[PDB]
Design a protein around this ligand. Sequence first.
Ligand SMILES: COc1cc(C(C)=O)ccc1O
Ligand SMILES: COc1cc(C(C)=O)ccc1O
Ligand code: NA
Ligand code: NA
Ligand code: NA
Lengths: 403, 401
Amino acid sequence: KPSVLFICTQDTKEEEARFTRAALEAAGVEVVHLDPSVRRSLGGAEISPEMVAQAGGMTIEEVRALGHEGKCQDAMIRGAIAAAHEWDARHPVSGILAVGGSMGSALAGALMQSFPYGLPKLIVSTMASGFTKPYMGVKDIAMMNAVTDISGINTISRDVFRNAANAVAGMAKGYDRDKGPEKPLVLITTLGTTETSVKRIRQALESDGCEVMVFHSSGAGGPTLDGLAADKDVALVLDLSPTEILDHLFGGLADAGPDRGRAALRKGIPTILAPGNADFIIGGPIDAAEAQFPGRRYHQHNPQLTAVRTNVADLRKLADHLAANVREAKGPVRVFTPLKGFSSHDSETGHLLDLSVPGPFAEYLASVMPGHVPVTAVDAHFNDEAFSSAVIAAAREMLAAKN
Amino acid sequence: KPSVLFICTQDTKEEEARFTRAALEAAGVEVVHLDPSVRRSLGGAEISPEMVAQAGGMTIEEVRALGHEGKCQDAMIRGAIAAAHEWDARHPVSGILAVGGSMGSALAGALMQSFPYGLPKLIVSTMASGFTKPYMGVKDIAMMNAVTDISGINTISRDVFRNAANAVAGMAKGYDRDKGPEKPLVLITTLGTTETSVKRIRQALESDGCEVMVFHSSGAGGPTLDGLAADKDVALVLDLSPTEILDHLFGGLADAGPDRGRAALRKGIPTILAPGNADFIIGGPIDAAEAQFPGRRYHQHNPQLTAVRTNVADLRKLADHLAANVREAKGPVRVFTPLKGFSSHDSETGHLLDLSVPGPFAEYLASVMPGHVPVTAVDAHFNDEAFSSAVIAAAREMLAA
Ligand SMILES: COc1cc(C(C)=O)ccc1O
Ligand SMILES: COc1cc(C(C)=O)ccc1O
Ligand code: NA
Ligand code: NA
Ligand code: NA
């Protein structure tokens, strides 16, 4: 029998998970239930909430002690993705089914984007608003809504759950993981403010036959890349947005701890580094951000998040940290850095342009990197075709290397 | 074996269509391929493009010569829906799978919205924008997207098509159309400018246990309601937006011919009429709309569509036509009309407001409707809670009768 990874929190409405798991089993698959609940642990799940938390580096006690709703969701996203790949590496699944509200669907979307293209993936959403919007697109994720007003406002339809179980079971029984052409797996980090070049890079390498995954470097994406680099078969890492490292260095909101970006280097995966988004630290709401980082220029991204302009002194600490990471690398590394700005905020159309910073940064980064890691300073903005073209050419050389 | 209705244009996706059909067959279903192609008519489709066109009342050559995105789409939607329900009438399907771009996905969505809640439904879209947006919400339609750039930009993936076929076959093999309680079926017409009250009406009757289908009355929706009313077990029709009748009278863009709105009445289904959106005729872009409909007032709804303000005389013609239709009714009919405006364009925060029209229109409408059909003039706007509540109360009485 094929195995389906089933993602569903039991702390709310435990009958949804019970019903859907029974419908999967009745349709002829085995179930591995991953339960990322924070409020209560009901039992009956292969991957318990406690296991989920710890896979991400926190005990559930520590997760429950977070006083920040965003950081708490990030911890369970990080844990769920870590636990799912740690499991799949040893016991491969043939499909992923998720049932959740706004937060649970968002967690499932991120997790599903980190599994291979073509693996069956289905989210059953239970919020009245639209489907979740996974980062940079739905990709191959199938979506169904279970909310109906028939028989009562905001009924959660068991007919949808039954249809979803029968669908995923059908897909899983038809799925042949070791089929089709093998596609080298390329992992990329980005923020919205570096998507222009990241999209060009993605499209070029996919055109070559690679499978490219793109992760949002806002607190959980970088850790997803790091987990894949350690536990799955990755051909190339393009760690182009070190937001989570820079925020770690200065107390920003994307802090994901000190080991961000080290895994690929320790595994010896060919890696390209770039300083996308190094023009800002991510602070909180404007009044808090200004209080935490006085005397700077700010851009209010949304009500919760403020881009805080960096300076040369800030980026020398980033350079030092990246150089130390690279000195631990067990495989090849290249570094590319743009001379005319790091993101769309740091641009002629943005609110944080400061052209005095890229030059000194590039010169210092080259001085601290070891001799076997060349730094290429590109006379372009990050989002210029000249910069994506330079990264693409380098990626293609690293992917052409023979065993 | 159960059957799956498979919607896919072969004139642009022939390889994908044959692959996906084969995958459905391998997974143990029979396939009914409905092919709404507009360029070519390739072999193997149960419901050919020619049938899609003619089931709606046009030859495929006539559809091709429209040259016009909206008129072509409306023709193929009307035809695809008529042909699909005609097939299903005698040979019932157990699921619907569609594979298409922007237009094919939208046609599939409209067709799926005219089939019962819970019947397996999956749209695989092939446009880069992602999923299509079915009118007033996805409800029970499942969505996938097959675009990928791997091995070539704007590829569409065999892995996704195979997953989609396996999914719908699995759902169809597990589907029991007789499971659960019967839901009384209620059909409603609307435009975006009457959605505020229609949403309340839908929610109240769904919460009573009804299945409610809602149709956009822009050229294909009304005809879908009429087809269902003629041929299916319908508990109640709320024909609250006679746009397609008004545009037939004046040559507007939602014209769907002379029989719009008659089927439910001729059959005898309990029906409520209202004059939602009677503040405007639908014209084309503003310059052409002014030339077609001179001497009026206009509101540019989007670059393609202009709302052309109606006047007293126009609405007396509409009332005459509605009354003629009602005199043919074989079952209960009631009428509700709002005294403070017919749509969100005809409101204090709308660009077509004319509060001098609803009062005299309501008087005239009552005078030409037969006396056994009540005509209630509500001292509210169409989209006010008082108006939806009046319609809901009458709907409940008519369902209980
Ligand atoms: C959290 O993700 C983002 C934050 C910013 C800021 C804070 O400007 C920009 C782009 C992003 O994708
Ligand atoms: C074609 O559908 C619509 C047209 C209008 C106009 C022409 O104002 C308003 C709402 C609609 O849902
Ligand atoms: Na949940
Ligand atoms: Na549950
Ligand atoms: Na939930």
